[PDB]
């Protein structure tokens, strides 16, 4: 409350560390469905169904231009990529499995870096 604060967690490395995680997600062999925005002209249904499209290249641009206020808003966009994937793709598809694999990969790096 006013003039009463928990001890200050060092967030000075968070930008660099999110960048490193994102590099590791970009270079994973199963990243290919997520590297670029889904083409809304060429994928029927996507525009209407997926209200907030997100992909690794958009996260990279937001990260590089100071559009994440804190490390949690960064994690919310990464998770949005996988939530969108599950919304649109069957679990038993190459893309559906890719999304599950990457969400696991992310969540481990996230816990190991920050928790």
Swiss-Prot record:
Component of the BRF-1 ISWI chromatin remodeling complex, at least composed of SMARCA1 and BAZ2B, which regulates the spacing of histone octamers on the DNA template to facilitate access to DNA. Within the BRF-1 ISWI chromatin remodeling complex interacts with SMARCA1; the interaction is direct. Component of the BRF-5 ISWI chromatin remodeling complex, at least composed of SMARCA5/SNF2H and BAZ2B, which regulates the spacing of histone octamers on the DNA template to facilitate access to DNA. Expressed at varying levels in several tissues, whereas a smaller transcript was expressed specifically in testis. Disulfide bonds: none annotated. Residues 9-113 form the Bromo domain. The chain holds residues 2054 to 2166 of 2168 of the full protein. Belongs to the WAL family. Regulatory subunit of the ATP-dependent BRF-1 and BRF-5 ISWI chromatin remodeling complexes, which form ordered nucleosome arrays on chromatin and facilitate access to DNA during DNA-templated processes such as DNA replication, transcription, and repair. Both complexes regulate the spacing of nucleosomes along the chromatin and have the ability to slide mononucleosomes to the center of a DNA template. The BRF-1 ISWI chromatin remodeling complex has a lower ATP hydrolysis rate than the BRF-5 ISWI chromatin remodeling complex. The gene is BAZ2B. It comes from the Eukaryota. This is Bromodomain adjacent to zinc finger domain protein 2B. It is found in: Nucleus.
């Amino acid at each position: 409350s006013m003039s009463v604060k928990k001890p200050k967690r060092d967030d000075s490395k968070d930008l660099a560390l999110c960048s490193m995680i994102l590099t590791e997600m970009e270079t994973h062999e199963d990243a290919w469905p997520f590297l670029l925005p889904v083409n809304l002209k060429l994928v029927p249904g996507y525009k209407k169904v997926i209200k907030k499209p997100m992909d690794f290249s958009t996260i990279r641009e937001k990260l590089s231009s100071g559009q994440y206020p804190n490390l949690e808003t960064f994690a919310l966009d990464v998770r949005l990529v996988f939530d969108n994937c599950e919304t649109f793709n069957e679990d038993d598809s190459d893309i559906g499995r890719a999304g599950h694999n990457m969400r696991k990969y992310f969540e481990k790096k996230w816990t190991d870096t920050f928790k």
